[PDB]
């Protein structure tokens, strides 16, 4: 039974990887206005 705050901060760096990813993919997108 771990659903808490404490248990949530392992999937952290899972997390973390798809914020880095979105941010990316988007940031590339949004430099593909002038192409």
Same mark, same amino acid.
């Given at each position: ?5 404490? %248990?949530?901060?392992?999937?952290? @760096?899972? %997390? +973390?990887?798809?914020?880095? %990813? #979105? #941010? @990316?993919?988007? +940031?590339? $997108?949004?430099? $593909?206005?002038?192409?």
């Amino acid at each position: 039974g771990s659903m808490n705050a404490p %248990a949530r901060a392992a999937a952290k @760096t899972a %997390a +973390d990887a798809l914020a880095a %990813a #979105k #941010k @990316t993919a988007a +940031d590339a $997108a949004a430099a $593909a206005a002038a192409a």
